[PDB]
């Protein structure tokens, strides 16, 4: 392949290798290796939310961490940076690590909360902070002959899509990205600089997102139904990011419905967000012991997939009463309670091992801010990369996305894009002249 940035006799070709260590045909523990002309790069370093202990890590044992020159972190979600203190403090890694300023500012407070609710300690987290360098958007940095820069990804505050250039070959990694304007976030940029290779998430496959006004209306109607029948409504969220969008939606709906003004809405969290929202109907809640659990009410609590913590405790307190209900707004990863209850089980198991009947209502209305097929198709068509590598999607979803994208470029005489869906540990190899 001739790099796009370029009849003369070609010299020898160089091989570029891409290998997922996590998020290959799965969602969770994003960690993708790039190898080219003696440079080695790691893209993201996450944990899997539906696995435990060392099982939740990417397959780092397949590389020599001392050989990695550069580690780029796309955004603050834990399936992209949750393994980072372990990688920085507990391996032979001695390379350079970058994230955007906002990502690092949130990451420090976020993983400390994660530890206090094991791969590493608070000491590991604080001792690894200085090993992380920051980068502004739209600025080139250079490490070991690798040039890189980032574009806005949408999705959450600070989220980046990294473009990488080595010896004239350019690769764009989306991280997680969204092309839908939020109430507080801009949409992801579409680079004018065209990459040879695109590594892109596959979270929603060939699904098309419901219109935002319709999802907001269904979300508000569901909450309204729950509190109107005397129920407590649980909204599990990751501590920061999408939660701020949901709170703005609810606060606006409450202001427009005076018959709801005596019903409280609690945001149970644990602030530079606004540095980088003064609600009229929402109250801050510090812990379960600070909460008068009076019905009816709305409580937005972490974690988003209810694996443990306050959202799990409230779920177990509330699940046996049909008046109550839970509204799940995130992507539900395999192995989590939030995913498990999608099958409508008759009973659930508490953290303490007791069986309880599941009578509260369960509704799924996604606001997870990922790309859908229409957004992903448009993005790829604007860039026309000769090679597209799908990551970060469940196996069936990713296989359908691959098949649909291949069908889009069969009769195209300008370019015949190749689409790859590697399993974890499987290499994609590409030769450049
Ligand atoms: C034991 C316990 O208490 C606990 C265990 C694991 C976690 C944990 C781990 C990974 C991801 C997450 N959750 C997030 O990072 C929030 C964003 C999220 C969540 C689910 C799926 C996806 C994303 B996405 O936007 O980035 O892409 C796919 C949570 C949190 C708490
Ligand atoms: Cl070179
Ligand atoms: Cl191999
Ligand atoms: Fe994310
Ligand atoms: Fe993700």
Coordinates of C-alpha atoms and ligand atoms in Angstrom, one line a residue, residues 27-28 30 75 77 79-80 155 176 203 370 392, ligand 5:
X27 CA -16.9 -4.8 25.1
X28 CA -14.5 -4.2 28.0
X30 CA -9.9 -2.0 25.7
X75 CA -11.1 8.8 27.9
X77 CA -14.2 5.3 31.5
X79 CA -13.0 0.0 30.4
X80 CA -10.3 2.3 28.8
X155 CA -19.0 10.8 24.3
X176 CA -15.5 5.7 22.1
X203 CA -20.7 -1.1 20.4
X370 CA -21.9 5.6 21.2
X392 CA -15.2 -2.8 21.2
Ligands
LIG5 FE1 -15.9 1.9 26.1

